Amino acid sequence: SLNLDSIIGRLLEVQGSRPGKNVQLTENEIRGLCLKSREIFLSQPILLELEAPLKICGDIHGQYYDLLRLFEYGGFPPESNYLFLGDYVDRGKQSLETICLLLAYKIKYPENFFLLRGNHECASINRIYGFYDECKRRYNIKLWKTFTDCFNCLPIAAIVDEKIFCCHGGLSPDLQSMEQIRRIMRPTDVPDQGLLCDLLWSDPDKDVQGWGENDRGVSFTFGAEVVAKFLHKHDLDLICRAHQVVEDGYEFFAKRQLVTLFSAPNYCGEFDNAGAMMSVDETLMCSFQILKP
């Protein structure tokens, strides 16, 4: 069952076509992707331990053809190892094509392809910001609940060669030990507060010493000193997150102690931002590849 090669083939078939060309997989093929990837997610740790080399990417948000460009410029799997930091759906016009290809690669190369959970991989959020609408339109309500059951098993964070800490949002006032993350059981919803919430929602802030209230109305903001203390305590060099759109696709914080990655250029078509992608080699040297709109 589950013809992975056929699915992937039909998903890659629309390269170079007029931007907007859909890929209508069958309800069963998509449901198969959710269930199989769900196993692999639960089989792997909730706190991924990864090795170089690999490519890190930020938010995609249903911008499917921009995702294909990333793979085109960065190298289609398994020519390159990948780590995505979440927010694959919502706001884009092709969330379905986006998440399906990602899951398809997750199943095809489970040791060379990894997906983190963003704050939009939550039922409470993607019901409103477009993903549920897309499911209702092109399929049915029950397919959406299937995606929900799959998103609840996504890993939350990742550490690359004991030096680079990766998560969608940022840090948490309740994050004292790395075991506090490993102790979280899946499947799980995203609470409106706590460790799991902050890891997917928090933002860095220049004008903040310590922790401050977050503009989003959820979680907190954190300052440069918090990043410094955090990195020193766990013997880490870099924090690699996403969650926020930045002009050049990448943006440094606290003297290059933290980096924000965003991989969706022309976000919502309302921004003029670029998308970036960070490559990390075996010597832990990080380089950026930019996608101009």
């Binding site: 740790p45 460009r69 410029y73 590849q289």
Partner: peptide
């Protein structure tokens, strides 16, 4: 080749970035 660890080096940043137009 797998890169998932079972359950000395330092981080540097390349001064050159590649820019793709599309």
């Amino acid at each position: 080749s797998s890169i998932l660890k079972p359950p000395s080096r330092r981080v540097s940043f390349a001064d050159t970035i590649k820019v793709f137009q599309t």
